[PDB]
Amino acid sequence: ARTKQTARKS
Amino acid sequence: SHIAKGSIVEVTSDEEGFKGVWFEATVLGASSKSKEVWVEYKSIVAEENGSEPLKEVLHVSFIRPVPPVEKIERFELYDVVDAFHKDGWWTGVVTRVMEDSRYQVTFDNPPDELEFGVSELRFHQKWVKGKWVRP
């Protein structure tokens, strides 16, 4: 439900 | 055993901004030198709007089985916890018990404080030497 980079933080 | 084809696992990365996070995945294949594991994420997608779950080939070091699920009605203050956030498991510590079965959890790298319900949390366990270990 999301790409890997919209899972990363900041 | 958790490496076997079709077995449900959790996987992590060391690319910066990813260290400390565990994503749910399913094993597709494994090397029988390389010792690699081929996996398909459950909630992470290949790119964009996303119809295809992301597939990845990771070293066996970044793969662990899924931690046993527990019946949990409440966490106590300063409990070390995993929070399901942005489709990934993040480790933090309960820094305030709120009303309505809710909790404040403090995370690091980067420093942050988030609110979670009880259902979004589980006990933090590291997979060490084929054993689940609480801190």
Buried residues in B91-125 as b, exposed as e (16+ CB within 10 A): bbbbeeeeeeeebbbebeeeeeeeebeeebbbbbb
Q: What dihedral angle (degrees, nearest 10) is formed by the CA atoms of B36, B38, B44, B50?
A: 140
Tokens representing residue B60 in the block: 């066996």
Q: How do the domains of chain B map onto residue ranges?
A: 8-65, 80-133
Chain B contact residues (CB < 8 Å to A): 17-18, 21, 23, 41, 43-48, 50, 54, 86-88, 110, 112
Answer CATH for B8-65 from 2.30.30, 1.10.3470, 2.60.40, 3.40.630: 2.30.30
Decide if B8-65 and B80-133 have a common fold: yes
Decide if B17 and A1 are in contact by the 8 Å CB cutoff.
no
Contacts of B87 in chain A (CB under 8 A): 1-2, 7
Query: Domain B80-133 adopts which CATH fold?
Result: SH3 type barrels. (2.30.30)
CA Rg value for chain A? 6
Within 8 A by CB and 6+ apart from B107, the residues are B83, B90, B91, B92, B113, B114
Measure B47 CA to nearest chain A CA, in Å: 5
Which one of A4, A9, A10 has the shortest CB-CB distance to B44?
A: A4
Decide if B45 and A2 are in contact by the 8 Å CB cutoff.
yes
